[PDB]
Design a protein around this ligand. Structure first.
Ligand SMILES: *[C@@H]1O[C@H](CO)[C@@H](O[C@@H]2O[C@H](CO)[C@@H](O)[C@H](O)[C@H]2NC(C)=O)[C@H](O)[C@H]1NC(C)=O
Ligand SMILES: *[C@@H]1O[C@H](CO)[C@@H](O[C@@H]2O[C@H](CO)[C@@H](O)[C@H](O)[C@H]2NC(C)=O)[C@H](O)[C@H]1NC(C)=O
Lengths: 314, 49, 97, 49, 52
């Protein structure tokens, strides 16, 4: 079932990753950080991978109008009608599944993906990607014609079934935090907050370990202790921007959606050229509407081949 | 066309870890000393250097 | 060699051994950052696709139409074919009639 | 001649006759379709301009 | 971003639009020797000027 197709995603969770330039020429730790962009399709439908998943609510259940994202140590929720992808203008989101957005875009140099926070703020991550597609065939058109030819060309489907390719996922590491420490005269207090916390300290002896409650240690300073969240019962994508846990062993694999499929896609026929006869010569008047490739050769012993990209009438 | 697989980096606090060779195409491993990783919460390890 | 055709090679599509030479040089991470930097010469296959040249389809002499799967050339007009034939006696007509 | 100057000619602005030669050709409609496909050389006046 | 004309617009009390547009050939080249578009996550720091 479609809901049953999410059986895997019960074991995963969003993450926070580093956008070098995330809207205003500033580096930030965004929850919508871009990881990689794949453009193997001939049609030109980009597939984008980013930290936040789409299709899971915070209660880990199917919903097609809702996005779950990492925020602090928690998982917050946002609406899907607040998703924007853009290269230079405005882009069209053909499909979306979990960690992936399947979209189609006009030519440009940069790529930006943005969503809306629960506080009605805008979170955007934007990177550099030289996108300039050329359609299959021998003409660089821009819009399908209503009369032409069908040529085989490759695209990405919307099926969510099992696919051969896979993505590795591993165990999330400890997340440093400092907002879990307070001063009381001459002692330091740490609050559990509902999650297991690991502490290391240098005041006295035997002040290292792990806790699940509010602890107080006397004769210690704020700048003298470290606390970090440790539970991490869920899974996380292996990304080169988040440190790897102690265990160097892979924890699992997860299928990725939108495989590559062979379809038939449309091209227009060029206008016939004007032929003027002559003594062992021909004169061709060429009237192109788009950049079109023109080639010719002779059927003798040694041929005089030629080919060029005609753009204007010649 | 190829793809470059890079796993999440390993960080050790107050310790040195050496990496051994492997039988993989164009495997490249390196170790670096004196690093102070940061995260969205704060410092990662006590050991400054 | 890196950067040109043949940057990675494999004996067959399903083979488990792969030879690659693409200059994967690593670099020191920037202070106060968690990332891994690397400099690598771009894929030679895309470069070859960019400026492969002219195909034999638009260059073959004698009007030789080239097709693939299987690789073949059709309607190539060169030379002559000798023909040897053995006829039965029922395909002729006698002089009398 | 089609494609160049004077592809359509008229003795005056108000004349009721016209001489046109623009290589109009019609094509068979695509299956499962209702339309009219035609190919014709662009206007020679714009090319001259 | 790069362009040719610059337009500044606001709204009015009666929810009208008030915009005005001038011509300004703007194409800014980042400092250094590389014509990049977005900042990288590993590079060099170069002295450079802005508005505080
Ligand atoms: C486009 O069509 C071709 C022709 O069938 C597909 O190529 C075949 O793919 C199957 C995969 O099941 C292979 O077993 C065959 O050996 C392939 N044939 C050849 C001649 O290579 C191709 O897969 C289609 N494109 C996509 C994206 O599936
Ligand atoms: C807890 O922190 C202390 C220091 O804050 C760590 O002790 C250091 O350990 C390294 C190697 O084990 C030594 O080179 C240093 O000299 C030690 N520092 C001090 C002040 O003694 C200790 O390893 C940390 N333990 C954990 C579990 O994080």
């Amino acid at each position: 079932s479609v809901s049953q197709h999410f059986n895997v995603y019960k074991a995963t969770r969003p993450y926070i990753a580093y956008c070098a330039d995330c809207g205003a020429g500033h580096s930030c730790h965004s929850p919508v950080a871009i990881e990689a962009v794949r453009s193997e399709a001939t049609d030109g439908m980009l597939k984008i991978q980013f930290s936040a998943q789409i299709g899971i609510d915070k209660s880990d259940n199917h919903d097609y109008t809702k996005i779950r994202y990492a925020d602090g140590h928690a998982i917050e929720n946002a609406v899907r009608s607040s998703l924007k992808v853009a290269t230079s203008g405005d882009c069209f989101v053909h499909g979306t599944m979990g960690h992936f957005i399947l979209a189609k875009c006009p030519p440009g140099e940069f790529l930006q993906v943005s969503i809306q926070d629960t506080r009605n703020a805008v979170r955007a991550c934007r990177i550099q990607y030289h996108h300039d597609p050329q359609p299959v065939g021998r003409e660089k058109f821009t819009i399908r014609p209503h009369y032409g030819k069908e040529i085989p060309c490759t695209t990405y489907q919307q099926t969510t079934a099992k696919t051969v390719e896979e993505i590795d996922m591993h165990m999330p590491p400890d997340t440093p935090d400092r907002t879990l420490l307070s001063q009381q005269s001459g002692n330091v207090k740490i609050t559990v907050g509902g999650k297991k916390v690991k502490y290391n300290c240098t005041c006295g002896t035997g002040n290292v370990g792990t806790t699940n409650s509010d602890m107080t240690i006397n004769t210690c300073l704020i700048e003298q202790c470290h606390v970090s969240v440790t539970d991490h019962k869920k899974w996380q994508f292996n990304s080169p921007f988040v440190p790897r846990a102690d265990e160097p062993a892979r924890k699992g694999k997860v299928h990725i959606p939108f495989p590559l499929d062979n379809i038939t896609c449309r091209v227009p026929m060029a206008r016939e050229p004007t032929v003027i006869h002559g003594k062992r010569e021909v004169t061709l008047h060429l009237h192109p509407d788009h950049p079109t490739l023109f080639s010719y050769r002779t059927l003798g012993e040694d041929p005089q081949y030629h080919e060029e990209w005609v753009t204007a009438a010649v | 066309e190829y793809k470059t697989v890079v796993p999440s980096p390993y960080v050790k606090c107050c310790g040195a870890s050496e990496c051994s060779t492997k039988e993989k195409p164009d495997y490249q491993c390196k170790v670096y000393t004196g690093v102070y990783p940061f995260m969205w919460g704060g410092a990662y390890c006590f050991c400054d250097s | 060699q890196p950067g040109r055709f043949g940057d990675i090679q494999s004996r067959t599509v399903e083979s488990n051994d792969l030879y690659a030479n693409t200059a994967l040089k690593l670099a020191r991470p920037s202070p106060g950052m968690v990332h891994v930097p690397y400099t690598q010469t771009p894929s030679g296959f895309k470069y070859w696709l960019k400026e492969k040249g002219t195909a034999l389809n638009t260059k073959a002499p004698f009007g030789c139409q080239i097709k693939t799967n299987p690789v073949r050339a059709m309607n190539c007009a060169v030379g002559n074919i000798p023909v040897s034939m053995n006829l039965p006696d029922s395909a002729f007509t006698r002089i009398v009639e």
